[model samples]
Target: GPELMNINDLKLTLSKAGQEHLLRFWNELEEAQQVELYAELQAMNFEELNFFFQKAIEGFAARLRPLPPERVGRSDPETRRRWEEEGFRQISLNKVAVLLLAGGQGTRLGVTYPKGMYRVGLPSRKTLYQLQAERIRRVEQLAGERHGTRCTVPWYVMTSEFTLGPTAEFFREHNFFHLDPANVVMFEQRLLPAVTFDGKVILERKDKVAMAPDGNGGLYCALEDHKILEDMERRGVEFVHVYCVDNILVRLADPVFIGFCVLQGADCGAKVVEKAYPEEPVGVVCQVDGVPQVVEYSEISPETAQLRASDGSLLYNAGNICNHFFTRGFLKAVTREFEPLLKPHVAVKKVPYVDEEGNLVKPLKPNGIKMEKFVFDVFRFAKNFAALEVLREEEFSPLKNAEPADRDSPRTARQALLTQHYRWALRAGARFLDAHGAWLDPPAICEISPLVSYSGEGLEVYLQGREFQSPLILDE
Candidate 1:
């Protein structure tokens, strides 16, 4: 009944490929060295490799249902009023938690530290993490101010194996432990193998494989691996708001998203933006063979990409920004039953190895490929999923690779966040003046305290008529 291949069958298929590639690369290696390498690879347990493969495929299949839009019970006005009456009251009473995915390095930014260490000035010269922390604090303060109750939103950070020590040290150095130690939990995702084109695993160091956390989707496994879910259950935390680390524009513990998900009885909810165009290189939320899955922009056909809704919106307009809300129970289900359904996509790269003559022969092109499972690949496991369309102008900018052509290049991400902040500030009543003493188009940059500006309220306040000089120092 399980729609997965038997482990023995998968191993047989891989053995054939491994033998073929070994022969191709054999002539290049010295006879003795080739024998040794072959023995090592042959010694690997084929059953283990097949197990991983089967799990990945099954996880993908389980999450294949198309999600119908959940009914939002109230209008914006009504929702806002209810939030003021009950939501704010609940938040002020310290019933929320914020989890950050700070597993990325700033290699793209040409920085050696974690991406959260990036500094941007808005009135406060705060680093991304500090800005994020302060935003939580400010939100808590705001809730308390409005509801006359103490507010505490626990912050949980999911650090990768490579990032844990540095991230912990950074927080310690900043005296950021003011948030309860119990409230600030940091967990790591599981690492998987990086194999050669022929499926031979690569050694990263002496003891570890050249592996990476299988994208954000590994979040489910990480939670289970770290036992963080038990803590969430104990705390009665019903909803979790998750986002990537690179986006400076991310809103922490977004209540609107949380309320929306809660109202819909959805197991998982995604916040998406309209693609800039039909051909924008972003994965779209779609039903794959009638199952909820993100079809890579590259995979979608030109004809399908050109499909438009009657309202002039692109039919496949829900561009995934990696912002999401996962109910605690739903996440538990994924961890228990759906984690294995994810699949790994292969990436071919040219790797360096010494040739038989002791001369290094670096191929000009890819010599082998490695497989990786994107976090989004698990969408097929969602029994009930929905996409919430958000204005890109208000949400969804990512900081990724540094190439000029990269959509989330450092320069582009920073500029996008700055532009968004400036626009918000302008709407809030900030004045702009030209060099010649003429008033310029509202010249205001919303003060984003990396620590305090985690929610839209910060933008709302900054744009609602706040004034600050240029190069504002928006620190925590």
Candidate 2:
């Protein structure tokens, strides 16, 4: 039978790739399980896998140099105002879209659900997905009001095999957060096999193979696979704002960012924050042999990282925050021309696997390598790239862990939002009162709904000269 021949060919392929152990339990399985394992095995691209493993063993180094100072956009007040105006103009034209990298699960945060569904302890108690959706709604309304035209910032969310079903159900239950359902596109990225340190594939169960999401850089491939770029074209979306979902302070489809990049005639853009100190364990936007790319902190020497300008600021300080802008044309070119050239980075992980005895073993030490491609790998392909440096506090607090961890914990994420809103209230001349009705220097909790105000605009009328409690919700 063809099925029997298929199994023999798969065995030959696996043997050639030195991965026959993946089928060690083949004879002991039920017919259904055999079918499942057969399907998984048939999808194996052993040739490419072996090639990647060889490259991984040899390792590669990215040549690094400081990005030209002129390439980083530092905004003045007037220029920022103009960028904001231009951003609104682009949005009103329905030329912008937001692509969210929300495929990460809450494993790092010590939870079982997707990260987007987790709520920080904000006064509003909204999940990250809810907050982001509302921001899109508000941005659309603001842009529409500015130009007296209707606007829609189609939000394209990328999910993974593990998070897709749960995240889809979550948004459906929330009625798409009141945004038009048609404008919210949810699709899953592909998952690649998680291989042993020696480059052998592992089985999670007799019927299944251990796999991991192909990293956020998988976006380029997934976009092409899912025909998301075609959908973007149909909707007249020319600009894409891609960002991670964990940032509590993320600005959705940010007009100012889009405007600035457009003004520069940039095909690609990155929003960066100055490195807190030399060697802050973050990648920096820089050039390598005149080609722009992110230089991982580990790749640079202490001296090069510590180098400073004559005025004393760190020479290589444009920290990559994973927030980026892209043109529709560049994205198309990337998936077609640049994706094949992007190398996969190795992530050491403690992957659970099934032993010969059919027991699931969770090793304490890192046991395997998960090959990942980064979203920024395509930055080097951009002909005209721009890096915009923004204040970290106003833009980059990410929620990555659970309580008790110092940084990137939910506690810190919530605090960053409160601090930003407190500043917004102060800027709008609003006064905060303690339990005794006495003035409070900094409010304990302040949350301004995105629906109420985009940035700090239209707040002076509602909050000016008004006294509010420590924990206040400015939703009017």
TM-score of each: 0.78, 0.93
Q: Model 1 segments beyond 4 Å from truth?
A: 1-46, 53-76, 80-90, 93-95, 105-111, 120-123, 203-208, 299-303, 349-363, 403-407, 441-446, 450-476
Residue 175 lDDT (model 1): 83
RMSD of 2: 2.6
Per-model CA lDDT versus the true structure:
0.63, 0.85
Least accurate stretch of 10 residues (summed lDDT) in model 1?
A: 65-74
After superposition on all C-alphas, the RMSD of every candidate to the true structure, in Å, is 7.3, 2.6
Give the C-alpha miss distance for residue 344 in model 2, angstroms.
0.6
> After superposing candidate 2, which stretches have Cα over 4 Å from the reference?
1-6, 31-33, 61-63, 301-303, 356-359
Q: How many backbone clashes can be found in candidate 1?
A: 33
Number of the predicted model whose TM-score against the real structure is largest:
2
